[PDB]
Amino acid sequence: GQMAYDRAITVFSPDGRLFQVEYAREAVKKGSTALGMKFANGVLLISDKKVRSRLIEQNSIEKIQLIDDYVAAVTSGLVADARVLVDFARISAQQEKVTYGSLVNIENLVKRVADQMQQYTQYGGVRPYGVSLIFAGIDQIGPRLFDCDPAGTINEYKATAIGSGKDAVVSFLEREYKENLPEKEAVTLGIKALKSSLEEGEELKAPEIASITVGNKYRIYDQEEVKKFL
Amino acid sequence: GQMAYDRAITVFSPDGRLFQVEYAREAVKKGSTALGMKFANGVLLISDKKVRSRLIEQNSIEKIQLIDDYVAAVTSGLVADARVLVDFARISAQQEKVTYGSLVNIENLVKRVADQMQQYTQYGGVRPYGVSLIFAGIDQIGPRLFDCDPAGTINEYKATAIGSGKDAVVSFLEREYKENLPEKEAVTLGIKALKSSLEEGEELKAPEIASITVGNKYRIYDQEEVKKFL
Amino acid sequence: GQMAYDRAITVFSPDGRLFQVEYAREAVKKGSTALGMKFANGVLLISDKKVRSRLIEQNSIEKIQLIDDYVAAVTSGLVADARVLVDFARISAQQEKVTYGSLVNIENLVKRVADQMQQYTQYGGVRPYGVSLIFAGIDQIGPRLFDCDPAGTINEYKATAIGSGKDAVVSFLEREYKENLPEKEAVTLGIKALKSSLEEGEELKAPEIASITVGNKYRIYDQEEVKKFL
Amino acid sequence: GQMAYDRAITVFSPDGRLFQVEYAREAVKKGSTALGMKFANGVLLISDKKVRSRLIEQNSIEKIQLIDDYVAAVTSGLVADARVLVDFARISAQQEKVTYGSLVNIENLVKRVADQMQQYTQYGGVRPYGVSLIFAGIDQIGPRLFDCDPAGTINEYKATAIGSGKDAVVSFLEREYKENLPEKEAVTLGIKALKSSLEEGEELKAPEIASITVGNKYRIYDQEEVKKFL
Amino acid sequence: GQMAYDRAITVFSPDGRLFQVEYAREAVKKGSTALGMKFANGVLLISDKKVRSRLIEQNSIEKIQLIDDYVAAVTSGLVADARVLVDFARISAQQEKVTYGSLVNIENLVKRVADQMQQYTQYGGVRPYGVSLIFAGIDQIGPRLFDCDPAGTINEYKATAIGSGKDAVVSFLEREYKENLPEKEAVTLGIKALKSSLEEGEELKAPEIASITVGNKYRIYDQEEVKKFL
Amino acid sequence: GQMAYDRAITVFSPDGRLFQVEYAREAVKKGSTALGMKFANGVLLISDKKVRSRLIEQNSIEKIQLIDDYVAAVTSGLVADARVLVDFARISAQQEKVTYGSLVNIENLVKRVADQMQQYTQYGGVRPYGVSLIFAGIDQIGPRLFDCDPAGTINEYKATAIGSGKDAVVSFLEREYKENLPEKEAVTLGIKALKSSLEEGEELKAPEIASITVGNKYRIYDQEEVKKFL
Amino acid sequence: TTTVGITLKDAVIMATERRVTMENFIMHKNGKKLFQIDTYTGMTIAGLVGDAQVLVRYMKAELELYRLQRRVNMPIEAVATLLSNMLNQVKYMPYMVQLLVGGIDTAPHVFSIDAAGGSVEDIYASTGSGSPFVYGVLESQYSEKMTVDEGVDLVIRAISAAKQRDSASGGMIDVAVITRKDGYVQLPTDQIESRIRKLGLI
Amino acid sequence: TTTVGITLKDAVIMATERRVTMENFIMHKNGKKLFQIDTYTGMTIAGLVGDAQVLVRYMKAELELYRLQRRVNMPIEAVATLLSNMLNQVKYMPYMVQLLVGGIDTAPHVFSIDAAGGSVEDIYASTGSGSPFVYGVLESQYSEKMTVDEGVDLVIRAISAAKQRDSASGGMIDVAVITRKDGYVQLPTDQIESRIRKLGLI
Ligand SMILES: C[C@@H](NC(=O)[C@H](Cc1ccc(O)cc1)NC(=O)OCc1ccccc1)C(=O)O
Ligand SMILES: C[C@@H](NC(=O)[C@H](Cc1ccc(O)cc1)NC(=O)OCc1ccccc1)C(=O)O
Ligand SMILES: C[C@@H](NC(=O)[C@H](Cc1ccc(O)cc1)NC(=O)OCc1ccccc1)C(=O)O
Ligand SMILES: C[C@@H](NC(=O)[C@H](Cc1ccc(O)cc1)NC(=O)OCc1ccccc1)C(=O)O
Ligand SMILES: C[C@@H](NC(=O)[C@H](Cc1ccc(O)cc1)NC(=O)OCc1ccccc1)C(=O)O
Ligand SMILES: C[C@@H](NC(=O)[C@H](Cc1ccc(O)cc1)NC(=O)OCc1ccccc1)C(=O)O
């Protein structure tokens, strides 16, 4: 039954489902866990790192990407598709700055990215992007936190997560998250949430941390500062 | 089950896999083994040679190709697709020089090549390139070493390998690689890594060696110098 | 198993094979045997002739075609596709002469032809050319000898062959070929190689012979001269 | 086995065959037999006529068509496709006259027609022409006689035939054809060849005869002259 | 066997047949019978009428259509496709008059219509017209009578028929047709031919009659004149 | 058998049928019954109304649409496709008025609509309109009444009907219709015809009535006048 | 340039001179300005040489294709109409030519066509810089009852007068006669010279 | 610029000078204006150097491809017709050149082609600013019965006269002789100098 309605993107199932979009969401769950949360006059992003062999440079596997000095993004899923979407977001942000002289709402930037992803779910001959993204930054309204799925759906969160351990992290944040926390406390809480999603075999491995506050630009935590919360 | 989701490039499997991309990676493993590693103020490339009949000229089977005087590439997989990608890289490098007057980051050149390969995995009516590439050179940041797969993924390495004996070489380099080695020592280590990947029947056959140092252009090792490490 | 991955050109097999390209190579092996070899300051081409009924004019079945006064080609496989590729090569050669005033490297001409053939193996809605070609001539580097397959692969040889008796001829040349032979000796050796590939029933039938030397243009052997080596 | 590789034009069989092209050749063998032969300073065409009911005008079923005053063609196979190809040949001939002021080689005209037919065997969404053609005329080289098949192959003959009785006619001409015969003798020989291809039930029925000599234009034999050889 | 080669227009059968074209000819045989014949300095058309309910106006079911004042056409098969082809013929006739100032040969007009129909039998994504047409008129050569089939074939007749009772009418005309008959006698003969094609149950029902003579325009027989031959 | 030739619009059945067009006609029979008839110097339209819940406004379910002040149309079948065709007819009518300054023949307007519908039955990638239409109005010839089917066929009637109860209404009109009736009598006859098509369970429910006379514009019957014939 | 075409009872006579003025001097003395474009049709050209030669090649191709498809020669008025459409379609980037078309389909015809595509049938016409001198001779001496021999002498005298007064005209006179019985016949040069000597024009 | 081409019984002789005037002064004294474009065909160029050089490359490519496809050399009149079409197709954005084409197919031919695509065959022709001086020499001294040696001396004298009166012409004279027996042969410079000394032109 299901195998008869899961071969083409533009085919609805008898119960009104799009299995090709659903299958793309399975690719997202294979990616590394990442999360973001808002705090007092700021927002931060944490991305888990799976340490590979020592032959890999520790500068290209960074999943946190700056869209500009005030907007950052983190992705999960197909790396190649994620790189294309990040490049599209950067071009879209600059187009906004050329047209109006500045960027006023981050939600508009997310919508342009999501509209691009939604287009690849309605026309034949293409496949949907197998990537989920989280956008966080500061605009003329304040700290913002958004997520985007392969289907192109947009939601705004006080705290959210993507990746393989998404369910474990969101459950942990459902119990222990507090609003308007200081930046240091928020990072400690985020480390515990990422810690509570791994298996018993492994342990936390000094992830990527980035944050921004109102009136300032994005700053990337160095390895020395990360070890302090480790 | 798998045979129902491995016929079209733009079809996701129920577990979120792209089998056509995976099958392209099988073509890569049929190619000859090649590797590259960085050393003190430089980077080198080694490509194994399978000696065919004496009727073949020993000038066209060279898998190491110069993108410019400061960037070189080596490929593995479908030869015909590899030639097209190398030509695309050379044109892309010259476009960068015309626009800005010079080449500043090699990673940008690799991204343009990878974006071309990623495009052939999302649109119907085309097949992905069955080629993996390694890019090494000197730019305004220093020695660089990149790899690219049929899916269009990009990673940066201190040392890496491609081809049939990729697993054996990377395991050997995982145990014996050292940083900031002199050029002569690095070549000797690379020969042993390539040696430790062949079967008991055959033996090493004077491969291709190329290297470059900061402030200089790429130089190709002649047969006389290769025999000295043989 | 194989029958599920051999219907479309743009489909990889589970073991990373392109069966449609492979099937095109089967059409090549149905053609008449042809070979070429380099000698002292020159290169020659020999193409076997299968004598049909006397009603056929002995001027159109010539498989050796001049690309210009200094480059010649011989083909094997589908005659109709071979004619199209030869016309494409002739146009490409003239485009080179208009742009630069002369032709410097024959290898560049072969690459343009091979790129055309490679394109017909990656896009849907078209089939690959079922033709293999051998290019021989004199350029600013010296005598050159190239071959091209339906997949678009390029190799340079001191001596090579195409067609049905390719395996027998290359084995014979693997044992008896010598470098820098005089033109008369090279033709005699080539006749024996073509002779050693036929079945016991038939015999050699005065084939086509063409050759060129440095500083001169291509000359076509007449029937009188061919009978002297017969 | 064969039924799995005979549905699409752009699909090679495992043994390197194009069955759709082969099937088009079957449509040709359903057409009426026609033949042409060269004689002393001239060339002629003979086309068998199958007499239908008396209600059909005896002016439109003529299979011999003049391309110009010096080139004529005869076709066999699908009538509708044959009409299109004849119109294409006439336009191509006039384009040659506009560009150069005259027509020098008839073989060039045949190649343009054959290239059109070859194109319809390599691209999807179209079917090959089910027509075989014979071109005969006088140019700056002398009497010419060509044939063309659905695959687009070109051959030059002293005498040839197409249609249902092609095998019988070519066998008869293989035994009794002579070169440089007078025009009257050549017509008598051609009538016997066409006669020797019919079944025992029927008999020859006053076919179409056309001929041309050097320095003159094409002339069409009238019914009175045809009865003289009947 | 047949069901494997009758789904696509651009697919040849193993015996060189185009079943989609053949199936279109079946739609033609469902139409009402119509016929035309030439007489002394003229030509006429007769089209059988199947009387439907009295609620239908007796002015739109007329199958005889004037292409201009000197050319008329009658169709059989799919009414909707027939209307499109008649409109195309009318536009084509006016294009001829604009270019040359008059219409010289009716056969040229028929060829343009047939070329349009032939095009819809060689390209995928379209279906052939299921219409057969008969063209009759006066040009600079004299009375003309042509027919056209879905395949685009053209034949010229002294008398012919189309529709369901085509076989019965042509057999009757094969026995009783005479040339250069007066107009009144020709109409009487045509009525008998149409009468001899119906079943025993029904009877002739005052059909459409149109005729034209040299030096005059087309005239449509009124019901009063039709009853005189009834 | 039938299931093998009913999947694509551009496929003929072995007996020369287009099942996709036939299936579109099934959608028409699901619509509400409507009819039109001509009377003395006028023509009227009646469309049955199926009373839904009271929450629906009684102004948008009107199936009678004015093309202009002198032409009206009523449709049956897919509502969404019907709206598109009505909009196309309105644009076509205005194009006629811009080009010539007025509308002379309504039949020309119907042909443009029918040509649009016929086009969607011959090209792949589209589906036919599942709508039947009736056009009635006054032009320079007099009262006109036309119908159009999904196949694009055009017929002119003194009285006709479309919808689910088409067969019952046309049978009733076949027995009781009279020509040149007064407007009041014609409406009473039309109500009885619509009444004689419903089932025993339900009853007539004050339908839509519109009419026009020579020299006047279209007028829509109000509910008060409809109840007088109820 | 001087071209002329006249009609008789059953014949059409066309004639031109041969002088070509390229780069403001007499560069060519034996140019060709009279062409056969069909079995019973001829054409003369005046104006830009490049434009005229292209049109001649186009007309030969169109008329030959027309004959092969419709099995009959194109009527003379249809030839003029085809030329009229071709020239008018590019009227704002036009061919800078003056054309005469003459031939036999069922009766003699001569057509004059301008650069804008205007086509007018006439009993006789003349084009080129020497045309007004020709019209003077034709107005005073042309007769519809003339024989073919008298018509040939008439066009020779008219062109000879033009050469005496128009510096852009000169060279040998080429004459063609078109009849149903004999088709398109170009008179030999020696015959033209004999007529010139007999008329006392040298 | 001064170019000339003449026809003899079985030969074609073409000759040019070498002066190139770039930026209103004599910048180059040894320019090339005579080219071999086929086995038995040559061409001379006058006008804009850039346009002329592009056309020479086009003609070499077209003629070589023609020879390879149809197995024979293109006829001389066909070469002129091809050039005529190419120039006329861009007449409103034209090549600002004057061209001479000469060669042997079955008989000697010389064609003159202008920027608008007009092509006229002639027994002899000359192009460039020095052409009127050449025509004066040819009108008084050319003979159709001349031998090849006499023809070579004739073109040398004609170009020498042009160099004495046209400031845009000068430099060494290049001469080519085309025959069926010997093909395209460019005369050596020393032989030209010997003829100049024998004729007393220095
Ligand atoms: C780095 C990134 N993940 C990754 O490393 C992803 C995980 C993944 C693998 C296979 C899939 O089919 C889907 C997703 N790997 C990935 O994108 O490369 C593997 C790949 C497999 C098939 C087609 C193309 C590429 C993350 O942690 O978000
Ligand atoms: C030189 C290069 N390898 C090679 O020589 C590759 C290896 C290969 C063969 C078949 C495959 O299907 C895939 C890869 N051969 C190759 O590209 O030519 C064989 C070929 C087979 C099928 C389609 C097109 C070409 C290397 O060593 O990297
Ligand atoms: C002259 C040339 N060979 C030939 O004569 C080739 C050999 C061949 C036949 C059938 C095939 O499917 C493939 C190759 N014949 C050929 O090209 O014509 C036969 C043909 C068959 C099917 C489709 C189109 C054409 C040679 O000797 O190289
Ligand atoms: C006049 C011409 N032959 C003919 O009359 C050909 C013979 C033929 C029939 C059916 C086929 O499938 C193929 C060929 N008939 C033909 O072209 O018309 C029949 C036809 C059948 C199917 C599709 C289109 C047309 C000849 O003698 O060459
Ligand atoms: C008036 C005209 N015939 C007719 O009335 C034709 C006969 C026909 C019916 C169904 C078919 O599949 C094919 C032909 N009817 C017709 O064209 O309308 C029925 C139709 C059926 C399926 C698709 C489109 C339209 C005639 O007598 O020639
Ligand atoms: C108002 C109009 N009829 C209607 O209300 C039509 C009747 C119909 C329903 C389903 C069908 O598949 C076809 C026709 N309904 C309708 O167009 O909406 C239902 C629908 C069903 C499937 C696809 C799109 C729309 C009428 O009375 O003419």
Side-chain angles (χ1 to χ4, degrees), chain E residues 24 26-33 47-48 50 61 63 75-82 127 130 132 162-163, chain F residues 12-13 15-19 21-22 25 121 149-153:
Chain E
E26 294 293 327
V28 171
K29 291 186 293 183
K30 288 180 172 56
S32 181
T33 308
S47 176
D48 187 13
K50 294 302 178 181
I61 55 180
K63 300 212 303 179
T75 62
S76 180
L78 305 175
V79 314
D81 294 3
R127 61 165 180 83
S132 292
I162 57 178
Chain F
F12 279 96
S13 74
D15 51 358
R17 305 174 63 182
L18 301 176
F19 285 107
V21 176
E22 289 183 0
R25 290 170 169 166
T121 65
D149 76 325
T153 76

Coordinates of all heavy atoms in Angstrom, one line a residue, chain E residues 24 26-33 47-48 50 61 63 75-82 127 130 132 162-163, chain F residues 12-13 15-19 21-22 25 121 149-153, ligand 5:
Chain E
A24 N -5.7 4.9 -35.2 CA -6.4 6.1 -35.6 C -7.3 5.9 -36.8 O -8.4 6.5 -36.9 CB -5.4 7.2 -35.9
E26 N -9.0 3.3 -37.3 CA -10.3 2.7 -36.8 C -11.3 3.8 -36.5 O -12.5 3.6 -36.7 CB -10.0 1.8 -35.6 CG -9.1 0.6 -36.0 CD -9.8 -0.4 -36.9 OE1 -11.1 -0.5 -36.7 OE2 -9.2 -1.1 -37.7
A27 N -10.8 4.9 -35.9 CA -11.7 6.0 -35.6 C -12.4 6.5 -36.9 O -13.5 7.0 -36.8 CB -11.0 7.1 -34.8
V28 N -11.6 6.5 -38.0 CA -12.2 7.0 -39.2 C -13.4 6.2 -39.7 O -14.4 6.7 -40.2 CB -11.1 7.1 -40.3 CG1 -11.7 7.4 -41.7 CG2 -10.0 8.1 -39.9
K29 N -13.2 4.9 -39.6 CA -14.3 4.0 -40.0 C -15.6 4.1 -39.2 O -16.6 3.5 -39.6 CB -13.8 2.5 -40.0 CG -12.7 2.2 -41.0 CD -12.3 0.8 -41.1 CE -11.6 0.3 -39.8 NZ -11.2 -1.1 -39.9
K30 N -15.6 4.8 -38.1 CA -16.8 5.0 -37.3 C -17.6 6.2 -37.9 O -18.8 6.3 -37.5 CB -16.5 5.3 -35.9 CG -16.0 4.0 -35.1 CD -15.7 4.4 -33.6 CE -15.5 3.1 -32.8 NZ -14.4 2.3 -33.4
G31 N -17.0 7.0 -38.8 CA -17.7 8.1 -39.3 C -18.7 7.8 -40.4 O -18.7 6.7 -41.0
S32 N -19.5 8.7 -40.8 CA -20.5 8.5 -41.9 C -19.8 8.5 -43.2 O -18.7 9.1 -43.4 CB -21.5 9.7 -41.9 OG -22.5 9.5 -42.9
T33 N -20.4 7.7 -44.1 CA -19.8 7.5 -45.4 C -19.9 8.7 -46.3 O -20.9 9.4 -46.3 CB -20.5 6.3 -46.2 OG1 -20.5 5.2 -45.3 CG2 -19.7 6.0 -47.4
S47 N -22.1 13.3 -49.3 CA -21.9 12.9 -48.0 C -23.2 12.4 -47.3 O -24.2 13.2 -47.3 CB -21.3 14.1 -47.1 OG -21.2 13.8 -45.8
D48 N -23.2 11.2 -46.9 CA -24.4 10.6 -46.3 C -24.7 11.3 -45.0 O -23.9 11.8 -44.2 CB -24.1 9.1 -46.0 CG -25.4 8.4 -45.5 OD1 -26.5 9.0 -45.6 OD2 -25.3 7.3 -45.0
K50 N -27.0 11.0 -41.4 CA -27.7 10.1 -40.5 C -28.7 11.1 -39.7 O -28.2 11.9 -38.9 CB -26.8 9.4 -39.5 CG -25.9 8.3 -40.3 CD -26.8 7.3 -41.0 CE -25.9 6.3 -41.7 NZ -26.8 5.3 -42.4
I61 N -24.6 20.1 -39.1 CA -24.1 18.8 -39.3 C -23.6 18.6 -40.7 O -23.3 17.4 -41.1 CB -25.2 17.8 -38.9 CG1 -26.4 18.0 -39.7 CG2 -25.5 17.8 -37.4 CD1 -27.6 17.1 -39.4
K63 N -21.2 18.0 -43.4 CA -19.8 17.6 -43.5 C -19.0 18.2 -44.6 O -17.8 18.0 -44.7 CB -19.7 16.1 -43.5 CG -20.3 15.4 -42.3 CD -19.6 14.1 -41.9 CE -19.6 13.1 -43.1 NZ -18.9 11.9 -42.7
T75 N -15.0 15.4 -44.6 CA -14.2 14.7 -43.6 C -15.0 13.6 -43.0 O -16.2 13.5 -43.1 CB -13.7 15.7 -42.5 OG1 -14.8 16.2 -41.8 CG2 -12.9 16.8 -43.0
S76 N -14.3 12.7 -42.3 CA -14.8 11.5 -41.6 C -13.9 11.2 -40.5 O -12.7 11.2 -40.6 CB -15.0 10.3 -42.6 OG -15.6 9.2 -41.9
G77 N -14.5 10.8 -39.3 CA -13.8 10.5 -38.1 C -14.2 11.4 -37.0 O -15.4 11.7 -36.8
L78 N -13.2 11.7 -36.1 CA -13.4 12.6 -34.9 C -13.8 14.0 -35.5 O -13.0 14.6 -36.2 CB -12.1 12.6 -34.1 CG -11.6 11.3 -33.6 CD1 -10.2 11.5 -32.9 CD2 -12.5 10.6 -32.7
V79 N -15.0 14.5 -35.1 CA -15.6 15.8 -35.6 C -14.7 16.9 -35.1 O -14.4 17.8 -35.8 CB -17.0 16.0 -35.0 CG1 -17.9 14.8 -35.3 CG2 -17.1 16.4 -33.6
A80 N -14.2 16.8 -33.8 CA -13.4 17.9 -33.2 C -12.1 18.1 -33.9 O -11.7 19.2 -34.2 CB -13.2 17.7 -31.7
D81 N -11.4 16.9 -34.2 CA -10.2 17.0 -35.0 C -10.4 17.5 -36.4 O -9.6 18.2 -37.0 CB -9.5 15.7 -35.0 CG -9.0 15.3 -33.6 OD1 -9.3 16.0 -32.6 OD2 -8.4 14.2 -33.4
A82 N -11.6 17.1 -37.0 CA -11.9 17.5 -38.4 C -12.1 19.0 -38.5 O -11.6 19.6 -39.5 CB -13.1 16.7 -38.8
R127 N -0.9 12.9 -30.2 CA -1.5 11.8 -30.8 C -1.9 12.2 -32.3 O -2.1 13.4 -32.5 CB -2.8 11.3 -30.1 CG -3.9 12.4 -30.0 CD -5.2 11.9 -29.5 NE -6.2 12.9 -29.4 CZ -6.9 13.4 -30.5 NH1 -6.7 12.9 -31.7 NH2 -7.8 14.4 -30.3
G130 N -7.4 11.7 -35.9 CA -8.3 10.6 -36.3 C -9.3 11.0 -37.4 O -10.5 10.7 -37.2
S132 N -10.0 11.4 -41.8 CA -9.7 11.3 -43.2 C -10.5 12.4 -44.0 O -11.6 12.7 -43.7 CB -10.1 9.9 -43.7 OG -9.2 8.9 -43.2
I162 N -14.8 7.6 -48.3 CA -14.3 7.5 -47.0 C -15.5 7.2 -46.1 O -16.7 7.4 -46.4 CB -13.6 8.8 -46.5 CG1 -14.5 10.0 -46.6 CG2 -12.3 9.0 -47.3 CD1 -13.9 11.3 -46.1
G163 N -15.2 6.7 -44.9 CA -16.2 6.4 -43.9 C -16.4 4.9 -43.7 O -15.7 4.1 -44.1
Chain F
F12 N -4.7 5.9 -28.6 CA -5.9 5.3 -29.2 C -6.1 3.9 -28.8 O -5.1 3.2 -28.6 CB -5.8 5.4 -30.7 CG -6.2 6.7 -31.3 CD1 -5.3 7.7 -31.7 CD2 -7.6 7.0 -31.6 CE1 -5.6 8.9 -32.2 CE2 -7.9 8.2 -32.1 CZ -7.0 9.2 -32.4
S13 N -7.3 3.5 -28.6 CA -7.6 2.1 -28.3 C -7.6 1.3 -29.6 O -7.6 1.9 -30.7 CB -9.0 2.0 -27.7 OG -10.0 2.2 -28.6
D15 N -9.9 -0.3 -31.1 CA -11.1 0.1 -31.8 C -11.2 1.6 -32.0 O -12.3 2.0 -32.3 CB -12.3 -0.5 -31.1 CG -12.4 -0.2 -29.7 OD1 -11.4 0.5 -29.2 OD2 -13.3 -0.6 -29.0
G16 N -10.1 2.3 -32.0 CA -10.2 3.8 -32.3 C -11.0 4.6 -31.3 O -11.7 5.5 -31.7
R17 N -10.8 4.4 -30.0 CA -11.5 5.2 -29.0 C -10.5 5.9 -28.1 O -9.4 5.5 -27.9 CB -12.4 4.3 -28.1 CG -13.4 3.5 -28.9 CD -14.2 2.5 -28.1 NE -15.0 3.2 -27.0 CZ -15.7 2.5 -26.1 NH1 -15.7 1.2 -26.1 NH2 -16.4 3.3 -25.3
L18 N -10.9 7.0 -27.5 CA -10.2 7.8 -26.6 C -10.9 7.8 -25.3 O -11.8 8.5 -25.0 CB -10.0 9.3 -27.1 CG -9.3 9.4 -28.5 CD1 -9.4 10.9 -28.9 CD2 -7.9 8.9 -28.5
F19 N -10.4 6.8 -24.4 CA -11.1 6.6 -23.2 C -11.0 7.7 -22.2 O -11.9 8.0 -21.4 CB -10.7 5.3 -22.5 CG -11.2 4.0 -23.2 CD1 -10.3 3.3 -24.0 CD2 -12.5 3.6 -23.1 CE1 -10.8 2.1 -24.6 CE2 -13.0 2.5 -23.7 CZ -12.1 1.7 -24.5
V21 N -11.0 10.9 -22.9 CA -12.1 11.8 -23.3 C -13.4 11.3 -22.8 O -14.3 12.0 -22.3 CB -12.1 12.1 -24.8 CG1 -13.3 12.9 -25.2 CG2 -10.8 12.7 -25.2
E22 N -13.7 10.0 -23.0 CA -14.9 9.4 -22.5 C -15.1 9.5 -21.0 O -16.2 9.7 -20.6 CB -14.9 7.9 -22.9 CG -15.0 7.7 -24.4 CD -15.0 6.2 -24.9 OE1 -15.0 5.3 -24.0 OE2 -15.1 6.0 -26.1
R25 N -16.4 12.8 -19.9 CA -17.8 12.9 -20.1 C -18.6 12.3 -18.9 O -19.7 12.8 -18.7 CB -18.2 12.3 -21.5 CG -17.7 13.1 -22.7 CD -17.9 12.3 -24.0 NE -17.7 13.1 -25.1 CZ -17.5 12.6 -26.4 NH1 -18.5 12.0 -27.0 NH2 -16.4 12.8 -27.0
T121 N -7.0 17.6 -25.6 CA -7.3 16.2 -25.8 C -6.2 15.6 -26.7 O -6.3 14.4 -27.0 CB -8.7 16.0 -26.4 OG1 -8.8 16.6 -27.7 CG2 -9.7 16.6 -25.5
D149 N -19.0 19.9 -25.7 CA -18.7 18.7 -24.9 C -17.2 18.8 -24.5 O -16.4 19.6 -25.0 CB -19.0 17.4 -25.6 CG -18.1 17.0 -26.6 OD1 -17.5 17.9 -27.3 OD2 -17.8 15.8 -26.8
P150 N -16.7 17.9 -23.6 CA -15.3 17.9 -23.3 C -14.4 17.6 -24.5 O -13.3 18.1 -24.5 CB -15.2 16.8 -22.2 CG -16.5 16.8 -21.5 CD -17.5 17.1 -22.6
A151 N -14.9 16.8 -25.5 CA -14.1 16.6 -26.7 C -13.9 17.8 -27.6 O -13.1 17.8 -28.5 CB -14.7 15.4 -27.4
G152 N -14.8 18.8 -27.3 CA -14.7 20.0 -28.2 C -15.7 20.0 -29.4 O -15.5 20.7 -30.3
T153 N -16.7 19.1 -29.4 CA -17.6 19.0 -30.5 C -18.7 20.1 -30.3 O -19.1 20.4 -29.2 CB -18.3 17.6 -30.5 OG1 -19.2 17.5 -29.4 CG2 -17.2 16.5 -30.3
Ligands
LIG5 C1 -19.7 13.1 -37.8 C2 -18.5 12.2 -37.9 N1 -18.5 11.2 -36.8 C3 -18.7 11.2 -35.5 O1 -19.8 11.6 -35.0 C4 -17.6 10.7 -34.6 C5 -17.5 9.2 -34.7 C6 -16.5 8.6 -33.7 C7 -16.9 8.4 -32.4 C8 -15.9 7.9 -31.5 C9 -14.6 7.6 -31.9 O2 -13.7 7.2 -31.0 C10 -14.2 7.9 -33.2 C11 -15.2 8.4 -34.1 N2 -17.8 11.1 -33.2 C12 -17.1 12.0 -32.6 O3 -16.1 12.6 -33.0 O4 -17.5 12.3 -31.3 C13 -17.4 11.2 -30.4 C14 -16.1 11.1 -29.7 C15 -15.7 10.0 -29.1 C16 -14.5 9.9 -28.4 C17 -13.7 11.0 -28.4 C18 -14.1 12.2 -29.0 C19 -15.3 12.2 -29.6 C20 -18.6 11.5 -39.3 O5 -19.7 11.0 -39.6 O6 -17.5 11.5 -40.0

